[PDB]
Amino acid sequence: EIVLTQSPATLSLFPGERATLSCRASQNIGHFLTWYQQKPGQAPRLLIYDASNRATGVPARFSGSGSETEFTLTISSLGPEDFAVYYCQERSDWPRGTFGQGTKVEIK
Amino acid sequence: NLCPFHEVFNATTFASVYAWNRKRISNCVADYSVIYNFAPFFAFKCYGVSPTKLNDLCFTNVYADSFVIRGNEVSQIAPGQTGNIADYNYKLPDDFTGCVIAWNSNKLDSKPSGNYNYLYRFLRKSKLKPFERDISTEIYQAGNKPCNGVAGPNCYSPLQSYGFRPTYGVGHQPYRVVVLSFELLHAPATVCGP
Amino acid sequence: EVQVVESGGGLIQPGGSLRLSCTASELIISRNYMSWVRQAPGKGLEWLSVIYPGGSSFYTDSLKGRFTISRDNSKNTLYLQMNRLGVEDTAIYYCVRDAPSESDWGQGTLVTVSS
């Protein structure tokens, strides 16, 4: 079973800074990785599919990169609404997949 | 004369799984030893027929269905299987009598930056019947409002490109599959072993 | 915004059974890759089951036999029969429609398996 490791567990940043999130896969999954955003009390929101393609309606500040076993999600400028829990899901057997543990973005 | 088997196996381009290519072999003398004794055939499954005794049987007709799929989708090329490829791309009957052969074509089907020339059908209104082909590119209406043959919200193009790259695991690397179907119909036999 | 609405989730005794129901407004559930996902309270998400547009259904190894995903093509409803529920099966069950560039999750229906 593929297990995805997300670091850092919590990412403390000021609004406007650049946030970089990491998701390491135990097996080579190519570009089949998906990034979700979950506000508290809301369902996950699809941000990036195929580890690089930005989902429709997502602001341009979100940008995914990496391949094989090292994927990252980069937020150019953390907005007031960009503080959430970000999940990476390997979709090597789409629509099936295993999620990451999440990388919460919290400062104070 | 001898059969075109190694003209099917050594073909330079294999068809997309959604448009698999069928070759009919008849009035022939089939030598399956060369197929059964070639190194790269990492998968050689025979259903309803023994691979070693194949030379001791003659059939009215033989078909060779060749296509390219991912490594992890090779498990679906077998009777009774279901999934992405069995349902919409290439279905084998439960009473299939033949052999399924697959080998990794990473060195020749993968391009750096992606080989998007191989496509498959991932949406269909219903499963395929065994040995059925569906090469229609009509937009798949997954919604309620008729979207008038233009890809948009809730209606997609049913064909998805594989996008192989030289890297990726063995499960995501291209695999060249050729399925041999042996047929008997009460008509005179035409493909023997010796 | 595409709305998928779950239902049928609530309190149930351990060893009991539940049948969550999912329906959508502007899409036909019989034509979409409809999956079921859950998020255990204070834990990460977990993918449970999927039913293909053609009718093929797949489950996680830990749920085969217990959970049974189906649908009613006439009612436009997706079901998830849940049998022999344990306390660990408590979670918020999402009904997510899968497309290559889209993934529409429902609000989620809480299932509490406790005495």
Q: Hey, is the C-beta of B125 within 8 angstroms of any chain C C-beta? A: yes
Q: How many CB pairs under 8 A join A and B?
A: 22
H runs (alpha helix) in B42-182: 84-88, 106-109
Q: C18: closest CA among C26, C33, C8?
A: C8
Q: How far is B108 from chain A (nearest CA, A)?
A: 18
Q: Hey, is the C-beta of A52 within 8 angstroms of any chain C C-beta? A: no
Q: Hey, is the C-beta of B168 within 8 angstroms of any chain A C-beta? A: yes
d(C-alpha A95, C-alpha A34), whole Å: 11
Residues of chain C neighbouring A44 (CB-CB closer than 8 A): 45, 94, 103, 105
d(C-alpha A92, C-alpha B7), whole Å: 33
d(C-alpha B27, C-alpha B3), whole Å: 9
Domain locations along chain B: 5-133+159-192
CB A81 within 8 A of CB A55: no
The vertex-B69 CA angle with B66 and B70, nearest 5°, equals 150
What are the strands, taking DSSP E only, across chain C? 4-7, 11-12, 18-24, 33-39, 45-51, 57-59, 67-72, 77-82, 91-98, 103-104, 109-113
Residue A101: phi, psi to the nearest 5? -85, -10
The vertex-B178 CA angle with B172 and B181, nearest 5°, equals 140
Residues of chain B neighbouring A97 (CB-CB closer than 8 A): none
Residues of chain A neighbouring B165 (CB-CB closer than 8 A): 30
Residues of chain B neighbouring C52 (CB-CB closer than 8 A): 83, 87
Where is B9: in which H helix or E strand?
A: helix B5-9
Chain C residue closest in CA terms to A97: C47
Q: Which residues contact B20 (CB under 8 A, 6 or more apart)?
A: B65, B66, B67, B89, B90, B133
Q: Identify the domain containing residue C43 by its residue range.
A: 4-113
Residues of chain C neighbouring A101 (CB-CB closer than 8 A): 44
The vertex-B31 CA angle with B9 and B181, nearest 5°, equals 60
Q: What is the CATH number of the domain that holds A17?
A: 2.60.40.10
Structural method: cryo-EM
CB B99 within 8 A of CB B45: yes
d(C-alpha A21, C-alpha A19), whole Å: 7
CATH topology of domain B5-133+159-192: Alpha-Beta Plaits (3.30.70)
Q: What is the CATH number of the domain that holds C74?
A: 2.60.40.10
Which token pair is B136?
């229609």
DSSP single-letter state for residue B127: P
Which token pair is A91?
């979709």
Q: Can you give the three-state secondary structure of chain A, one letter per residue?
A: CCCEEEECCECCCCCCCCEEEEEEECCCCCCCEEEEEECCCCCCEEEEECCCEECCCCCCCEEEEEECCEEEEEECCCCCCCCCEEEEEEEEECCEEEECCCEECCCC
Q: Which of B89, B119, B138, B144 to mutate to test the interface with C (most CBs of C within 10 A)?
A: B144
Q: Hey, is the C-beta of B13 within 8 angstroms of any chain A C-beta? A: no
Residues of chain C neighbouring B145 (CB-CB closer than 8 A): 26
What are the strands, taking DSSP E only, across C8-75? 11-12, 18-24, 33-39, 45-51, 57-59, 67-72
How many distinct structural domains can be found in chain A? Answer: 1
Chain A residue closest in CA terms to C49: A96
Q: Hey, is the C-beta of A9 within 8 angstroms of any chain C C-beta? A: no
| Inter-chain residue contact C45 with A87, CB threshold 8 Å | yes
Q: Identify the domain containing residue A51 by its residue range.
A: 4-104
Q: C6: closest CA among C38, C44, C53?
A: C38
